[PDB]
Amino acid sequence: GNNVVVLGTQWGDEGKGKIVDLLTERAKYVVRYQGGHNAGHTLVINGEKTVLHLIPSGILRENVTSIIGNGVVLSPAALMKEMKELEDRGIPVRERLLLSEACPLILDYHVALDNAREKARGAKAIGTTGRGIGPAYEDKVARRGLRVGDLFDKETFAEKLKEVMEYHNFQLVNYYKAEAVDYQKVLDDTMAVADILTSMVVDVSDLLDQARQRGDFVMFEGAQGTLLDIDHGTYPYVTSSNTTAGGVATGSGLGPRYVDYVLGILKAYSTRVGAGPFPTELFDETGEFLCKQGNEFGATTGRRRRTGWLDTVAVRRAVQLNSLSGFCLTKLDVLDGLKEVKLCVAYRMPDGREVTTTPLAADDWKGVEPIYETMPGWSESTFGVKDRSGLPQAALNYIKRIEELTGVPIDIISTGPDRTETMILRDPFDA
Amino acid sequence: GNNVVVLGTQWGDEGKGKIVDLLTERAKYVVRYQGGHNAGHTLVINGEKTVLHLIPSGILRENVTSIIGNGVVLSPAALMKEMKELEDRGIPVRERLLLSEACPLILDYHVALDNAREKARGAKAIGTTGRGIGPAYEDKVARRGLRVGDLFDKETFAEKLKEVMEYHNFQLVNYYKAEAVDYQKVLDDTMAVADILTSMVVDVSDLLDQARQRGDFVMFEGAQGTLLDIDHGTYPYVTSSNTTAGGVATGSGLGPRYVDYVLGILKAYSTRVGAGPFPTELFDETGEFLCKQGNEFGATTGRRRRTGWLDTVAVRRAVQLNSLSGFCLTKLDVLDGLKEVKLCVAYRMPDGREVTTTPLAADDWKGVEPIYETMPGWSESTFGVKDRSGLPQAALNYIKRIEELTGVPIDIISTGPDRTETMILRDPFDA
Ligand SMILES: Nc1nc2c(ncn2[C@@H]2O[C@H](COP(=O)(O)OP(=O)(O)O)[C@@H](O)[C@H]2O)c(=O)[nH]1
């Protein structure tokens, strides 16, 4: 299909960057539709690694036009830092990146609040990346926040900013008792690159409509994952944007009817950074082992990730909400050397009931116990293999079982961090 | 198509209620996916009128199951008041209405803040319905708000509430200097109907997935209109939810790929309540005349609506964002007796440039001047007519011209407030 969505079927970190980078080879555009610099992906081409956060994972490809859509809360300081790093490396960012005047601006006071609020929560802390995403999203809905388009009239920008900062400082010092974020600093910092951001402005919605009418390969790229959806994830242990496929049309302007195929990045086992329900969470040697072989540490905060088994019950939630077309199974290689592998098939509720459906809010995950099927592991190295014939039957049955339990075929399989250590059984674009 | 979306192509108030009521005759379900009690629709069957706000417009139809989805910020006091009124009239609401534990709860302090913030804005006031939608949406994204599911554990609910109210009162009195909203009052009011709301809980996302697999006619119902979209409307003079088709999947749980047809309710002329850019706004006899024959007064605040000509440039924005399939032209009858009728075809920008594309943020609408095509009106009464043969050629050309300028066919036409004063040239369900 012409319009292909790529997102996280678990709790982010399942492998989006590598995949969008791999698949954008035929794309004209690439779009980020939600999130901000809370994201973090490691792309790896012939060993050379690239860590992105705010910038779409098609930015290294010349033939592609990256675009950060209105859904995204954009941080001026952040883009700039990622910009120089890629330019210093031969990737002419400003020449290939487009943005939307409607993106909300993440400014210092936003980090100041996120840290404050996260502090106040004490032990019930969310475990946020610490980037100011929540508050930026807050001012967005409150209709008090500033967006890229605001930079068109600098005088006016400064007026708005002065009072938004007026509003936010009163709380910071009087309520949380933290230090105030100085207005001039913020005004100066921002004005120093206002001209850069604004140059990058394009009417995104009308552009996708234009690209759609011509049949241009557009790939939409998600951040975080499904269970982090502000509406459908483990509330309140979630991010503040609709990480689910519904965020595509809202944060881009493309009418929902034009979503062709939805690719769900499915990690071979599970991970999660931040507080929150995690049924299949492993605290044993295997947990330790997964974190190890999977080099499981946040690409944004460097925090160790919580590890556990693949959860089919949870994955099945991801299927229905995103209207999945297929799965891209990643990190199958990390399970190498495991005597046996389990996949959560059902939940045992605190009241003795057996279920195949996930609770909604986090408190409703409290009792919940995972019921599994324990399949045999495999001694063979699957790393870098690029053909199924190179996959031992154990690994094949594990894959097949996954499909059976979900009703969704594994269209691509990743066996290593490098773009090429991959096998595409069907390109989301060829249907 | 099985899944049909019905929404506002302008600024809300174009005729959604009557239409959803008319079309739900073949639907199993009806879903509200965003907004709250800010909405207000007048349904009219054989002269008897019904004014709804929070409850979906299929609630009067026995064979239909109404559902207010997670996208909707739900107000306990509000539902209850609308409930009794329909029950007192023979419509067993609790028997036909379903809700979602994930809906955020609008409570008093939310109205208290909305009034406060709206006050502070002085002359740059948004002109909100005054129902607390903004703040409710604010706490939602901030991850501090309460949802329906919270009512499962009353003890806990009371703990959360006490501190959310703790947080909100500090601002109300110390910052805005307004009176505090008392905690016990709120706790008591809510607990009095906790049992009613919760009884109505269903896993909405999984239910639509279930209905989808069986091919059940589902109609999604929007509130407000497109230019009121928090991301794509005339920011900040907008509502706080994605009124656009993208709000469907986000506020329901249905995967975006299952949207079949999108019906856009297109009023014959334009109206708008609240501050905000309005290119074709009429301040003359015609403006007065439209407001008159169109009985143009908010069904929620009773405020007079701003009137003006149909704006094709703006409507064309609605087309691309919602991925319209067709238009339901409403209120053609009000134009009866008009010597001539104009339709905005292009915008003249403050810099001499002619354009067919709408600015995004409200400040970018400042210069903007409408360029029109002035067609002839018609003496004939079109009221209640239910066949095109009963429509004078003037009216026909006006319709045809509309289609030409947009690329979207008018599938239904409404010639009066009563469900039956309507003509369906194509039922969104039969394709
Ligand atoms: N061993 C292994 N590493 C992988 C594979 N796919 C990706 N990686 C690396 O594994 C990680 C996925 O992490 P992260 O980038 O946070 O994912 P993202 O946020 O979805 O893009 C990064 O460290 C990638 O380089 C894989 O298939 N096998």
Ligand SMILES: Nc1nc2c(ncn2[C@@H]2O[C@H](COP(=O)(O)OP(=O)(O)O)[C@@H](O)[C@H]2O)c(=O)[nH]1
């Ligand atoms: N004359 C006339 N009145 C109509 C027509 N369609 C609906 N109405 C009435 O016009 C109004 C549309 O207003 P409102 O209900 O706010 O629309 P909503 O918010 O989209 O549902 C209500 O007063 C309806 O009863 C129509 O085709 N002609």
Ligand SMILES: O=c1[nH]cnc2c1ncn2[C@@H]1O[C@H](COP(=O)(O)O)[C@@H](O)[C@H]1O
């Ligand atoms: O890209 C991401 N990967 C993994 N977790 C994330 C990501 N973005 C946010 N989170 C988590 O979602 C929650 C809120 O983060 P925020 O986006 O920083 O508000 C915390 O658990 C974060 O660790």
Ligand SMILES: O=c1[nH]cnc2c1ncn2[C@@H]1O[C@H](COP(=O)(O)O)[C@@H](O)[C@H]1O
């Ligand atoms: O259903 C509606 N019809 C018309 N205008 C609405 C509706 N809901 C909200 N608005 C307008 O959208 C803006 C914000 O309203 P709020 O939903 O009350 O925040 C104001 O202009 C409101 O008048």
Ligand SMILES: O=CN(O)CC(=O)O
């Ligand atoms: O890629 C994003 N990280 O893993 C999340 C974080 O570091 O918080």
Ligand SMILES: O=CN(O)CC(=O)O
């Ligand atoms: O139907 C809703 N109204 O017309 C909006 C309002 O009264 O503010």
Ligand SMILES: [Mg+2]
């Ligand atoms: Mg990551």
Ligand SMILES: [Mg+2]
């Ligand atoms: Mg209305």
